[PDB]
Amino acid sequence: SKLEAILSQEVEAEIQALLQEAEAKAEAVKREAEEKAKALLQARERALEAQYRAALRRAESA
Amino acid sequence: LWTRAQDEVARLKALEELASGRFGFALLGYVPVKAKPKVEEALARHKESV
């Protein structure tokens, strides 16, 4: 009862701190997912920029 | 040093004779009626009188 509450709140605090660091692990997963997302979108930005920039170059020369 | 070592070794050998309950522990003893007050005073000195 009393000792239930004491030891169970202890296990609560331990696994709550550890599972919020696991939430920080999930947040680093989301962080790197945003990193890959911005690398995807910005590399596609550079790709469309360079491709249609060279297309303007080619239409200019023609 | 040998007195403190015998005290700690007796504590280890007595804790070997305990009963653990997976982050819990059981204890069973036999003490006379003439020392029930000091036993209750020692048991009050637990974490919350566990």
Curated annotation (Swiss-Prot), chain A:
Q: What is this protein called?
A: V-type ATP synthase subunit E
Under the cellular component aspect of Gene Ontology, which terms does the record hold?
Answer: proton-transporting two-sector ATPase complex, catalytic domain
Keyword set includes Aminoacyl-tRNA synthetase: no
Alphabetical keyword list: ATP synthesis, Hydrogen ion transport, Ion transport, Transport
For this protein, what is any one GO molecular function term?
A: ATP binding
Name the family the entry cites: Belongs to the V-ATPase E subunit family.
Q: Superkingdom, according to UniProt?
A: Bacteria
Q: Which Gene Ontology BP terms does the record give?
A: proton motive force-driven plasma membrane ATP synthesis
| Protein task | Produces ATP from ADP in the presence of a proton gradient across the membrane.
Originating organism:
Thermus thermophilus (strain ATCC 27634 / DSM 579 / HB8)
